[PDB]
Design a protein around this ligand. Structure first.
Ligand SMILES: NC(=O)NCCC(=O)O
Ligand SMILES: [Zn+2]
Ligand SMILES: [Zn+2]
Ligand SMILES: [Zn+2]
Ligand SMILES: [Zn+2]
Lengths: 531, 532
């Protein structure tokens, strides 16, 4: 026959279309869309039985264990994360390269990427992955700082196809000044990079943590109290101001604050190139879960402060940054996904064990009496596992339960926009004959009376296919799940089973994003020298 | 051969993708998309030479001559309008059926549509067309009326596939009170119709026109002065408030006011189902063009205007429409609205009256009728511009090529796909879907070519419009691309400047319920409609 694979009787969903058609796949790529394709032309035929077919999900906010250990030891390798991703319908992930301050000169940032690529080249990869670069040390003063930095960004792009840079406005060791952000923006704009910011006011966070500890208020729940949404709002406002002065396109990661969403919306209405990301957890969970409706029935989650009130430390399962917000906030995150505030949705996947206490990758790492650590929220490793649950959670709580407008909005923010904003388009993100990698998800049919033994009813840890010992969504009902995950024209997940023999993932060299060319709009008569 | 038509070497543009691929067409529909299709498989092969291929344009705001003469006599029939559409890359138009106050009972609104369908069934149609229903007489009081109106909308949908209703907040004879709008919203929400509003405060317009005439300020330019942007803003705010109270999806037609755009955006941010339309003229023209004397058209390059003919005091009427073309500095707002999601769709508000003949009932000079106490005052000027032909090329050029729109995808979204979705013609129309889409396609000229194309026009002229009007307001301006092929239901109807009449086979279109116009189910108080 002439094609490797034909998908029949399915409904194709893209960022802008929903329709019944059939797909042929060959040599790792989408080859054809047509009404009906002769089954004898394919080596393998999949009957979708009326189910939706979506592009594979693209999660551009994933944390994996890396050699510099910026977030300490993390339980998931690239092997584990990509396995988990695929079991949950995600077929591309983008992780983070930590700037290595021991490397100097023109190649310093390319050498930072090399550490990661070399490490992951020996692991079994279930899908493709890319890398963002994290920057936390910027040279001073600016006029030099901006010029050698320029050469370094070119080298990172030319050698490894990295075109995105991530910076922090909070966290000791990561927080950089406004002045240094401007220096970076100068370089990124010039090179057409995608500039990413974690926008919380680090000074306010630090002061409030100290004030809480002084009163002995150190339980997990006070992580939220130390940094209310007005702190994320202020910083996001300040960061927009910087981007405006510098005419530099900007993406805010994991937005959770209504105040932040407000200033982001206002900038987008003005036509400034301000992009935003949010995460399932900010729409589905509230901070009531950290101690003892448009989201998850919180009492249905198992192994939480509600079910285990004797365990005072169990709130740590849900500690992340920015914090899961108070009741009443979650609805404005859904509205943000529908109204255009959020360009993409990522997971902020970051995994630390709860049911083992001794390892360096345990949440209980917060207990270290010999290093003046006694379980205070300050010392809790921040993050939740989420790479597997991202796609099904939006399918269910978003599309089926009506919190997202349609399947097309789902695809737009989960698949196509991530590819576009991070320079993986059109190789990834869509279903384009002759062009797209054959990265596809076939779901189960929604309106069927037929029983599918392989379709899960609840989220469990075993279902995650990851290396962590818990998921925060443990025990909750889930109303659909990937029935097939196809990665580069091969079936890698089938009806609850991973097919390791079809794992052929590779590092992905990315291009410059067409969304991140500058507006050419300025506040004053000043222009950068190179203009 | 197995297929009627193959398009090779082109670049496919949809509402969310841009990519090089080839298309096969048979029996009026898109059959196949693939990297490369064997040319021996097609009866006809078109080499696109690297140019973009878009879906055909869908203009859901077109006015044609109709038997009840709501807008007086209009120069274009459905024959003329669809010919003009096709010459400009538009492959579906939606015009308007005037409520016939002489028909009574359950079938009264279906009977209104029948008048139009019957009349156009004898004309040569170059592409498909649908109809919106215009409502200006609502029965009172609301409760007792509910059954009849509800039953009437059902009959209009069941018999003629009409699923949209249009109402006016201005114009004597058309303006309806807030009370009556709520009665209509009650019925339309219940039937999943698309509710359309022209939102200008009619009372403010009426008062200010009388104030201006009292001072003798009657020239065409004072049309704009009689109804500044704050008037469109107020009424748009009022209409949103009504739609909110009634949990009814709403579309605002030809939005031109920054204040209107602002309250529209705020509602969209809240998640209310508020949609909006704008038109090329609100982004490209300013009111300076209505009397003698960088993001729009260079106004001095327009031929046959108050700039070139300052002797002709009435020539400003060529550019009189409602809402008015706005003062300098407003036009940029409209582009931003197209980019940031404020505007769901772009239509033309195509409405044609002759300028170079003065005697007929379809002339602009209709405003001169000494016996009916009419002496050229702006009040008597028939409102409207021809635009159905120029809509797609104007956005291609001044939008995509000149960088006022963000991408070709955004162009397709607002010009083709969203119009189909919001008015229940999707997926039959609006996209390029194998086995599903009517083969309605445009092949442009290649942008980056050094090759000469004798058939590619450099300027907009009246002759190029292929319409029945004797002017276009964009006469004389540079245009940097144009449809090279317009394919309608798998047949070539426009090729390189020539209309192919023998391939004209357009039909009336029965439309469905729009998936965008199901209600949000969100209310201001504990009250719910009886049927829920
Ligand atoms: N307003 C205008 O330009 N023409 C009359 C058509 C209409 O808007 O109903
Ligand atoms: Zn972060
Ligand atoms: Zn993170
Ligand atoms: Zn109107
Ligand atoms: Zn109109």
């Amino acid at each position: 026959p002439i094609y490797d694979l034909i998908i029949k009787n399915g409904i194709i969903c893209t960022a802008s279309d929903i329709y019944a058609a059939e797909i042929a796949v060959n040599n790792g790529k989408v080859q054809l869309i047509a009404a009906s394709i002769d089954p004898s032309l394919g080596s393998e035929v999949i009957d979708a039985e009326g189910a939706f077919i979506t592009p594979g999900g693209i999660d551009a906010h994933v944390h994996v264990d890396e050699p510099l250990k910026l977030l300490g030891d993390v339980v998931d390798t690239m092997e584990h994360a990509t396995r988990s991703a695929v079991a949950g319908g995600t077929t591309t992930v983008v992780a983070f390269s930590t700037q290595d301050v021991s490397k100097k000169g023109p190649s310093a940032l390319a050498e930072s990427v090399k550490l990661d690529v070399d490490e992951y080249s020996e692991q079994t990869l279930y899908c493709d992955y890319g890398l963002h670069l994290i920057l936390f040390q910027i040279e001073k003063p600016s006029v030099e700082a901006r010029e050698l930095l320029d050469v370094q960004l070119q080298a990172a792009y030319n050698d490894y196809g990295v075109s995105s840079v991530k910076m922090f406005m909070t966290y000791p060791g990561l927080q950089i000044s406004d002045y240094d952000i401007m220096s970076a923006m100068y370089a990124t704009r010039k090179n057409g990079f995608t500039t990413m910011l974690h926008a919380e006011n680090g000074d306010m966070v630090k002061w409030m943590i100290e004030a809480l500890e002084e009163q002995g208020l150190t339980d997990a729940y006070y992580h939220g109290v130390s940094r209310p949404s007005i702190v994320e709002g202020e910083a996001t406002n300040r960061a927009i101001t910087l981007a405006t002065t510098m005419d530099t396109p900007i993406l805010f990661v994991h937005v959770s604050s209504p105040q932040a969403a407000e200033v982001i919306k206002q900038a987008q209405t003005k036509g400034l190139k301000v992009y935003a990301e949010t995460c399932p957890q900010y729409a589905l969970l509230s901070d009531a879960i950290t101690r003892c409706g448009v989201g998850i029935d919180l009492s249905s989650i198992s192994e939480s402060p509600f079910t285990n009130p004797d365990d005072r430390f169990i709130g740590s399962k849900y500690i992340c940054s920015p914090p899961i917000r108070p009741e009443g906030t979650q609805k404005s995150i859904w509205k943000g996904m529908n109204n255009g505030t959020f360009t993409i949705v990522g997971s902020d996947h970051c995994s630390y064990n709860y049911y083992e206490k001794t390892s360096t990758a345990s949440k209980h790492r917060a207990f270290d009496p010999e290093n003046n650590k006694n379980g205070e929220f300050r010392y809790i490793p921040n993050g939740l596992p989420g790479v597997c649950t991202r796609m099904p959670l939006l399918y269910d709580y978003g599309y089926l339960r009506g919190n997202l407008t349609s399947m097309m909005k789902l695809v737009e923010i989960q698949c196509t926009n991530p590819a576009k904003v991070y320079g993986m388009y059109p190789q990834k993100g869509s279903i384009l004959p002759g062009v797209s990698d054959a990265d596809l998800v076939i779901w189960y049919p929604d309106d069927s009376k037929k029983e599918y033994n392989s379709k899960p009813k609840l989220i469990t840890n075993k279902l995650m296919e990851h290396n962590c010992d818990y998921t925060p969504f443990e025990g909750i009902e889930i109303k659909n799940w990937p029935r097939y995950t196809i990665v580069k024209g091969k079936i890698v997940y089938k009806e609850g089973e991973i097919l390791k023999e079809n794992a052929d993932g590779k590092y992905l060299k990315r291009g410059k994003s067409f969304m991140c060319t500058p507006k050419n709009e300025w506040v004053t008569e000043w222009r950068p020298k190179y203009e």
